[PDB]
Structure formats: structure tokens, C-alpha cells
UniProtKB/Swiss-Prot annotation, chain A:
This is Pre-mRNA-splicing factor 8. Residues 7-237 are annotated as: RNase H homology domain. It is found in: Nucleus. It comes from Saccharomyces cerevisiae (strain ATCC 204508 / S288c). It comes from the Eukaryota. Changing residue 23 to A: Reduced growth at 30 degrees Celsius. Strongly reduced growth at 16 degrees Celsius. The chain holds residues 1836 to 2069 of 2413 of the full protein. The gene is PRP8. The MPN (JAB/Mov34) domain has structural similarity with deubiquitinating enzymes, but lacks the residues that would bind the catalytic metal ion. Contains a region with structural similarity to reverse transcriptase, presenting the classical thumb, fingers and palm architecture, but lacks enzyme activity, since the essential metal-binding residues are not conserved. Changing residue 104 to A: Reduced growth at 30 degrees Celsius. Strongly reduced growth at 16 degrees Celsius. Present with 468 molecules/cell in log phase SD medium. Functions as a scaffold that mediates the ordered assembly of spliceosomal proteins and snRNAs. Required for association of BRR2 with the spliceosomal U5 snRNP, and the subsequent assembly of the U4/U6-U5 tri-snRNP complex. Functions as a scaffold that positions spliceosomal U2, U5 and U6 snRNAs at splice sites on pre-mRNA substrates, so that splicing can occur. Interacts with both the 5' and the 3' splice site, as well as the branch region. Has a role in branch site-3' splice site selection. Associates with the branch site-3' splice 3'-exon region. Also has a role in cell cycle. Component of the U4/U6-U5 tri-snRNP complex composed of the U4, U6 and U5 snRNAs and at least PRP3, PRP4, PRP6, PRP8, PRP18, PRP31, PRP38, SNU13, SNU23, SNU66, SNU114, SPP381, SMB1, SMD1, SMD2, SMD3, SMX2, SMX3, LSM2, LSM3, LSM4, LSM5, LSM6, LSM7, LSM8, BRR2 and DIB1.
Swiss-Prot record, chain B:
One of its GO terms (biological process) is spliceosomal tri-snRNP complex assembly. This is A1 cistron-splicing factor AAR2. Heterodimer. Interacts with PRP8 (via RNase H homology domain and MPN domain), competing with BRR2 for the same binding site. Component of a U5 snRNP complex that contains at least the U5 snRNA, PRP8, SNU114, AAR2, SMB1, SMD1, SMD2, SMD3, SME1, SMX2 and SMX3, but is not a component of the U4/U6-U5 tri-snRNP complex. It holds the Pfam family AAR2_1st. Belongs to the AAR2 family. The keyword Cytoplasm applies. It is found in: Cytoplasm; Nucleus.
Length: 237, 300
């Protein structure tokens, strides 16, 4: 059924699973027209499909041309997400196909179930976790590839860099969700924390800086402080 | 006008005949029901006074044979049987008519209720949903499950309604996933009407039979089927106008006949609110919407 804090270690077992987050598929800027009405302008989006055990992220870039001449775009976006996830599964070798797909938003359940009818043994599940994957577009290298795209494109990433050489997938996922939650809560301060020290760089082949084990502890504490600081600012605590 | 002779009434029982009902006392001198209108299917149904468990009954058409009811004390139920000797059956019916041991089917002349509830119901189609080929009449009870319920357990005692499942490969053409899920017209018109039922009369007949089994026996799977067949039409953007107009009439008479105090268990809030207020056909069922809003405004 649904995925929550009781069954959290299930994310790191040996059954292949993917999270699908659709919050950045249909993105718009809202603006006034010459006549003083309001209109939207779409910008490129992306589907965020992540294996939490391995860090493998299938980033399908959604180019604004897919919306041209279409109606009810917020509805269509869910079905386009489901279509692209289904296509992604069919493209993967049988031994790489997931046994479960966990959607971060319950409105993706029916679209994905209908697109996956051909795969009755792949479970489509919601989650009670509040995951911060909307903040994926705060990772500079991901935002750059999405905005530069001139056509639909699939870009493949490892969102854990080389961390699994040193830490478990449970710890890597916890680090990722802490970083993304911080970027979602206060993007400018989070990036400041991650880049303040010029001597620690992001490799050409990586998304995040090359922190030592001890530096990651410091960084993670600064991220927790940021989240707490922002919570106090929000609620006047 | 036809007649169904009871050999006797050894156990106290409430007897239904179509939308009517009456109580018979233990060992009361009751020998059956006369003046049954020719031209319609009928249902004769039973609820025991000492055990309301298992409402049960028999669908029949007096044009297909001479039928009677005999209490079986081993299986503990009033059983329908066919009498093959026509001269004997006429003789038994006449004597009991002379001794005034029968109730008369109490049809008011103005009253088209039974026709309106059974317009599309045919005995031959009943006998394909309820499979017992050696009899010309069909037994139904409160506990019988449907083929669809069994897939989600004795197959010989099942209600073989047509399976409707909105999230199934039958309902959804590959490549038309969003289209077919949000607009069920394909599934209604190509798969169900052209493909399975052949015409709207057969579809409505099954819909009406499902409603009647839900109402008369409290058969839960029958209620599921009735609502699914309504929802399939209401959730289609393209429906022939004559089907929409006929559906409005069908549903109006069903809602009119439903006992008020069974509305909580016989009506699905989600389906009815969706059908009347959100669906493609939300403005096509004027008569049904009017009676629903006046009789069951709570549900809505
Ligand atoms: Cl190639 C980066 C790892 N990866 C992501 C999706 N498939 C493989
Ligand atoms: Cl009709 C032959 C069976 N029967 C019915 C009532 N009494 C006898």
C-alpha cells in the first residue's frame, strides 16, 4: 500500500524501486498581458525518477513544445509523466525493471496505474513521506540541463555522486533529503553553505562538492541549523 | 392471467410477488397467487419469519411453463418446480380458485410500475446471468456472489453479470490511456454495446435486473453492477440521445420504487453525486435528478 516511516528500510532492500516526482513537469511564469489580463508562459520542466538504493536518477526533460496547443495542462502533465515513466520501464532490460514505483503525489496514482496495466506485477504506491524532490531544480547542474534543452531529452545522473563508496544507501538518502529540504526552505543560504569554502570543489563529473567525511558532518549540521533557523523565522519561535 | 399454486405453507413467511408483499402464517390455508399479468417477467420471493437470513426467490415468466412452489423440509426453503401435466395443473388451479385459497396479484389499472422496472428484462437473458439450465426459472438469493466478486467462490452458484472494470485493458486502448480513462465512450459504445451486449436494450435489461436483485434480495454484488452500469454511461461523453432519455426514465422509476428506509444501503453516494453533478451527463438526467433531490437530498 502506502509507504511511510514504519517501512522506511524497505527503500534500501534489494527489490528494485523508483520514486517518481512530477512537481517540476509543468512549470510556468504568471504575468500580465498588454490588456491587463493574466497569462502563463511555460518553461522547460522535468520528471524526477530516482532509485533510492543506487542513486541512479532518470531525469526526463519536458520541453515546452509538448504543451503547444494542448488544454488542461495541469491534468495533461500527470498523464504525460505516467506515459514517460511507462516508456522508461519498457526501455529498461527486464532484470532492471522496478518491482515498485512510489509516486510522491497521490494524483499520479491513477495515471500511472492506467499506463502500467501491461505490468500487473509492478506495484504502484503512494507515500506518506514528505519528500523535497521539488527542489531538484536547485541543483545547479540539473537546472542547467533542463533550461538549455531545445527538445525532449533524457539525462542520466547519479544523485549521490561517489558517496556510496563510503556510506550506506540509507545514509546517502538521508543526506540527500536533508540537502534538498534545506535548498527548498532557503535556497540562497543552502548554496552559501555548500560553496562558501572555495577549496572544496564540485568535480566536472559530480553534482555536489567533494567533502571529506568530517566536512559532511559539518555541512549536515549547518543544513539542520538552517532548517531550524527558518522554522523559527516562519513561526516566530 | 396466470397462476403459481402452493402445495402448502408450512412455515411462516413473508412472500413477495414483484413489488408487492404479504405475510403468511405457519400452516395457514394459503395455496398461491392468481391473476399474474402475462407479458412480463416476474419474481416470487421469500423471507422466513423465524430466520430473515437469506432472502431468496425465483424469476419466472408464465408463458414458459406452469410453475408451482412446494416447501422442501429437508433444504428448508419454498422451492419453485415446473408441472409438466397441463390438465392436472389446470385442475389444481381451478379447485383452489373456487375455494378462494389464493391471493390476487394486486395490480392497479393506472399503474405501470412493474413494466417500467422490467421494460428491457427478458427471461432468456436472466437464464444466462443465472446458470441452471434444467429449469425455466432462475433462483437468486441475498448471498450469491458475482463473477467479478469471485475474481477479487462456487462458480455454479454465481451471478454472471458482465464484468465492468474501469482500470482494465478491456477499458483502455493502448495509446489512448488518458482519453479512454477520462471519457469512457470507447468502452461503452465499442466494447460493451457493439461488442458484448449487441444493443442498448440488452444493456438496460441487465442494469434493470441488477437493480431488482439488489432491492429485492439485498444482493450486494448486484448493487455494485447496477452502479457500475450507470457510471459507465454517465462517464461517457458520447452516448446516443435515445439511450440518455431512456436511462433517465429507467432510473426515475427505480428511485421512485426504492424503499426510503433502504436508501442508505442501496445508493452509493460517490456514484450518484458524480453522475448527477460532475459527469459528462450531469445535465442529461432531468427526471432522475429531480426525484433524487426531492426524495434523498441527504445523500447529495
Ligand atoms: Cl549513468 C548515471 C547512472 N544512471 C542513471 C540512470 N541509469 C543509470
Ligand atoms: Cl400443480 C401440481 C403441484 N401442486 C401445486 C399445488 N398443489 C399441487
Amino acid at each position: 500500500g502506502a509507504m511511510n516511516s514504519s517501512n522506511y528500510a524497505e527503500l534500501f532492500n534489494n527489490d528494485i524501486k523508483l520514486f517518481v516526482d512530477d512537481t517540476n513537469v509543468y512549470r510556468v511564469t504568471v504575468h500580465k498581458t498588454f490588456e491587463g489580463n493574466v497569462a502563463t508562459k511555460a518553461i522547460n520542466g522535468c520528471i524526477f525518477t530516482l532509485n533510492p538504493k543506487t542513486g541512479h536518477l532518470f531525469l526526463k526533460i519536458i520541453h515546452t513544445s509538448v504543451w503547444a496547443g494542448q488544454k488542461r495542462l495541469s491534468q495533461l502533465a500527470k498523464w504525460k509523466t505516467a506515459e514517460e515513466v511507462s516508456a522508461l520501464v519498457r526501455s529498461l532490460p527486464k532484470e532492471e525493471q522496478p518491482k515498485q514505483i512510489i509516486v510522491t503525489r497521490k494524483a499520479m496514482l491513477d495515471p500511472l496505474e492506467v499506463h502500467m496495466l501491461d505490468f500487473p506485477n509492478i506495484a504502484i504506491r503512494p507515500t506518506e513521506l514528505r519528500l523535497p524532490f521539488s527542489a531538484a531544480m536547485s541543483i545547479d547542474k540539473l537546472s542547467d540541463v533542463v533550461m538549455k534543452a531545445t527538445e525532449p531529452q533524457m539525462v542520466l545522473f547519479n544523485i549521490y555522486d561517489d558517496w556510496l563508496d563510503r556510506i550506506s544507501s540509507y545514509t546517502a538518502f538521508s543526506r540527500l533529503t536533508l540537502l534538498l529540504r534545506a535548498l527548498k526552505t532557503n535556497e540562497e543560504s543552502a548554496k552559501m553553505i555548500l560553496l562558501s569554502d572555495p577549496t572544496i570543489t564540485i568535480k566536472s563529473y559530480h553534482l555536489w562538492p567533494s567533502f571529506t567525511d568530517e566536512q559532511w558532518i559539518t555541512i549536515e549540521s549547518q543544513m539542520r541549523d538552517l532548517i531550524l533557523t527558518e522554522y523559527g523565522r516562519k513561526y516566530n519561535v | 392471467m396466470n397462476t403459481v399454486p402452493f402445495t402448502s405453507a408450512p412455515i411462516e413467511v413473508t412472500i413477495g410477488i414483484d413489488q408487492y408483499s404479504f405475510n403468511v402464517k405457519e400452516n395457514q390455508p394459503f395455496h398461491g397467487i392468481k391473476d399474474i399479468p402475462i407479458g412480463h417477467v416476474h419474481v416470487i420471493h421469500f423471507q422466513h419469519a423465524d430466520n430473515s437470513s437469506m432472502r431468496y426467490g425465483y424469476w419466472f415468466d408464465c408463458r414458459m411453463g406452469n410453475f408451482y412452489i412446494q416447501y422442501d423440509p429437508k433444504d428448508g426453503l419454498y422451492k419453485m418446480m415446473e408441472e409438466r401435466d397441463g390438465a392436472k395443473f389446470e385442475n389444481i388451479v381451478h379447485n383452489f380458485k373456487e375455494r378462494q385459497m389464493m391471493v390476487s396479484y394486486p395490480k392497479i389499472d393506472e399503474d405501470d410500475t412493474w413494466y417500467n422496472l422490467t421494460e428491457f428484462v427478458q427471461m432468456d437473458k436472466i437464464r444466462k446471468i443465472v446458470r441452471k439450465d434444467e429449469n425455466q426459472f432462475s433462483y437468486v438469493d441475498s448471498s450469491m456472489t458475482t463473477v467479478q466478486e469471485n475474481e477479487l467462490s462456487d462458480p455454479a452458484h454465481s451471478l454472471n453479470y458482465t464484468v465492468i472494470n474501469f482500470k482494465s485493458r478491456e477499458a483502455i486502448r493502448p495509446g489512448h490511456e488518458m482519453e479512454d480513462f477520462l471519457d469512457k465512450s470507447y468502452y461503452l459504445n465499442t466494447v460493451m454495446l457493439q461488442g458484448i451486449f449487441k444493443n442498448s436494450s440488452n444493456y438496460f435489461g441487465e442494469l434493470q435486473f441488477a437493480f431488482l436483485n439488489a432491492m429485492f434480495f439485498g444482493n450486494y454484488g448486484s448493487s455494485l453492477q447496477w452502479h457500475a452500469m450507470i457510471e459507465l454511461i454517465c462517464s461517457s461523453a458520447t452516448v446516443p440521445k435515445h439511450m440518455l432519455d431512456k436511462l433517465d426514465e429507467i432510473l426515475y422509476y427505480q428511485i421512485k420504487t426504492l424503499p426510503e428506509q433502504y436508501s442508505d444501503i442501496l445508493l452509493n453516494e460517490r456514484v450518484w453525486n458524480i453522475c448527477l453533478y460532475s459527469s459528462f451527463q450531469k445535465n442529461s438526467l432531468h427526471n432522475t435528478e429531480k426525484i433524487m433531490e426531492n426524495k434523498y437530498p441527504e445523500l447529495l
